[model samples]
Target: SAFITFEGPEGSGKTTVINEVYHRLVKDYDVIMTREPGGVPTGEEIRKIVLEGNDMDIRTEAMLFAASRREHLVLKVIPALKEGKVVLCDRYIDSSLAYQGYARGIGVEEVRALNEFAINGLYPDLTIYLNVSAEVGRERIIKNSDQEDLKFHEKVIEGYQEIIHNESQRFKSVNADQPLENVVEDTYQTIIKYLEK
Candidate 1:
């Protein structure tokens, strides 16, 4: 029950804040931080296809993400969870729902079904959604100019919002537009409260 995941639009400081929280938790708890699509051998292989600027069909992308998630969970996350250690993942099933399902016009329930099978009912005990404006998120990640299309980024946030709205039980929507220190502090507090519970 110790699996936790972080989700956000691009450049919403997911990696930065996850790393910060991971370091803090590791000091006091047996925490191991990882990411989807690249945590294990098969998964890392799939990531080269998914994130390496290679273009694929929308459904193809969704299934690839599910495949990668399955391997990452079986090899990295599940083992850690079985050990009663905290596992912090940068992305998870919600990413597929946002990126491929909603943004890519692939249908949320369709993509969600694929990921459900891939993860096999192993949802996170806690999920942190870094809430930020779509424009703010795009500006943060698009300095290099080869980022996702503007419309795509906009829909991605909408997708995440819908998911968060529906799945509020295990989801915490954290304001990510604040100063870095403040964001990290609040996220750390969230994890501490969960631990204490």
Candidate 2:
């Protein structure tokens, strides 16, 4: 299956990069672009809860994410792959590992277990990691004022770095501190190279 996932700390311009990659590939491929926590109807409802349920504890939030992921994998991602479409997902289990696990002190290994069961081992063929400083990411966000402050986001960046270190073979990193055009171009080229391989 031609499945790819994008991961980054908050404000790494994930949506913009994914959109650029989608438009670039859609011309030559049957592609399905989506994001997690809201990829399916049930997942969307869960997303609302995850994002708005401020009083929820870390484990509860992580469980909800895993639940959403299970629905999304069963309802959307698996079906799209069976249809032979190139699937691009923005934010997957890494967000859980980084945000709820590491940043929230829930433990990455435990979070990984939850997500592993949720997707039932459906790992992406490739994962594009947009590397950016937490401060820079904080600077880039204009919306979603609900984001955590600098310290927490810094931990998230470290969490992603740890994941990259552990899963280097499955990941490709792009420096997101560059201009938008260059970031898009680099991402376009990276995916193209992967496809060629």
Candidate 3:
């Protein structure tokens, strides 16, 4: 069994890729696929606090995310892993490391330590990062979704870049500018390459 995560800028097709991967693997492995603060009432409430609660400092949002992560792990990830299942989380510690740590200027190490308190060293074995140019990212995000402020998304991607730059060992960047089939192919081959060993 393996733990993997998909991460990218808001507009990048990371979610689409995640669904494709899940569909391909659903028959082969016991895949526990989900996003954070998802499929749970309390988790959703925590997500609201993290994403929109008033007077939220970067640290506060980070902490809420970490707390939500703990609940997600307890309710979903841990149990699925113990069942010898492959887990595919849409976003995980890396998102916090990027969003609050790298982008929000809270310091990656500090955010990581805080998350450690929440997760106690639970980390994914592989992180699939779909890389996209910032300009391209802006266009995709602006066209596909209007919920986020453009400037905020820009900083978020900046954070992602810094995190990926510093933590190359844990991240494998995939070219996301290609066709959907090609993206899926690259992702599939990537996992196969790692799992083969």
Candidate 4:
């Protein structure tokens, strides 16, 4: 059994790659794919509030995300994990640490402290970081969320870099600036290798 999470900045094709990887793994393993902020029913409700609700304080946003994560982990992820399934989560605590903590000026450690309380001691067995430059991310995103500016995305990338550096052993970086098929193949192989071990 394993808990694996996918992390990347906007336009990194994380969703696409993870979906394909899931398909490949499901054929040979008891695996389930899910996403943060909306994995469980209650978490989905919170996701709506966080994504669609009126603008709120940065701390409030972070808290909402943490809350959703708690619900998702408790109700969904843990159950699947107990069943000895490989859980492929689209995102997790790293998202908050990068988006709210570093990019939004809350400090990575601060968000980490918050999430630590939410997640208790559970952490992913492996985290696949879809590495992509800000420029490429921006370009692909331009072709795709009109949320924050490019500067914010750049900070998110930097935040992820710092996170990977600090937790190097748990992270496996995959270059995501190539063709969709190549990125998907690389990510699938990464997970397969980890699973086989």
Candidate 5:
């Protein structure tokens, strides 16, 4: 069993691509596609408040995300891996690390330390980074601001870019400008390379 996570700035369309990859692998392997705040029931409940996008303090918000992630690990992610299934989560600790720590200027190391405390060192085996411009993402999101929680879209993008630039081995940045089909194809290949163990 291997844990795979998709990460990106909002509007990067990583969700769409992750689903594509999930469906493509559905017939061949035991695959589960879920995301934070709700992959498990408890997590989903927490996610609702987090995504509500209110003006909460960074620490408060980060804690909620960590709580959600912990539930996911306990109820869904860990069990799947234990059963030798592929857990394809849409977002994970990386979301908080990039969104809260780096992008929001809470500091990535601090945020990561908190999450490490939350999950107790459980980390994904691979993270697929969907890279895109904040300007373009902002424009797309404006079309539907009601569902928009730019928690730190600008910061998230910068954070992700910085991580990609420095922690090259930990992340695989995909050009999100591609058509959905192409993105899925590329993602499928990447997953095989990382999780075929």
Candidate 6:
């Protein structure tokens, strides 16, 4: 069994590519697709609460995310892995490290420790990072024209780069600046290679 996770900023075409790759792999592999923040019932409820709430404390927000992740992992991901299935997850701990740790100005180490407690050292076997420029990501999201949003997005990208750099062997990056078909093809091919190994 393999645990694969996808990571990228907004507009990196992660969802589209992951979906296509999942469909392709399902034909020849024991695979299941899922996403972070809301994979199971309890996780979905936490996701709703975190997304809709206003002025939430940064630590509180991070804890809520870690809590949601714990529920998803315990309920869905672990069981699927035990059954020898390829778990293609849309997002995972890296999202929290980028968004809350780096972008939100909460020290990466701090947030990481929080998540480690929640996840108990469960990390993906491989992480497919959809690499896209911050400008491209902002353009794809369109209406997020706020200046602060741009800076935050840039920081998120930087955070991803740092994370990837630290764990080079665990990550394979795809150029998401290309056309949708190429992005999907590259992602699929990369996963196929990993699975074949």
Model 2, 46-133: lDDT tens digits are: 8789799868887888888789888888898888899988899888888788888888898989999988988888898999999988
Colliding pairs, model 6: none
lDDT of each: 0.84, 0.85, 0.80, 0.89, 0.78, 0.89
- Which parts of model 1 have CA positions greater than 4 angstroms off? 51-54, 142-148
TM-score list, all predictions: 0.92, 0.92, 0.88, 0.94, 0.85, 0.94
> What overall lDDT, based on C-alpha atoms, would model 4 receive against the true structure?
0.89
Worst 10 residues of 2 by lDDT: 141-150
Candidate 1 residue pairs that clash: none
Sliding window of 10 residues with minimal summed lDDT for model 6: 143-152
Model 4, 1-197: lDDT tens per residue? 89999999998999899999899888999999987754488888886787886878889888888888999999999988999999989999898888898889998889999999999989999999999999899989878644558788889999998888868777999989998899999888888999898
lDDT per residue for candidate 3 within 88-176, as digits (tens), equals 88889878877788776889899989988988788888899888767777777667755456667778877777777766666888888
Residue 131 displacement in candidate 6 (angstroms): 0.5
For every candidate structure, what is the RMSD over all alpha carbons to the true structure, in angstroms?
Answer: 2.1, 2.2, 2.4, 1.8, 3.2, 1.7
Better of 1 and 4 by lDDT: 4
Clashes of each: 0, 0, 0, 0, 5, 0
Model 6, 59-84: lDDT tens digits are 99889889999999999999989999
Q: List the residue pairs that clash in candidate 3.
A: none
| lDDT (Cα) of model 5 | 0.78
Cα lDDT tens digits for candidate 5, 1-197: 87888898777877778888898888777888776644478888886887896887778888888888898888878877899888888878777778788867788889879999888877777889887787768775675663345546776787777766666566777777676678788888888777665
User: What TM-score does prediction 1 earn?
Assistant: 0.92
Total clashing pairs in model 6 = 0
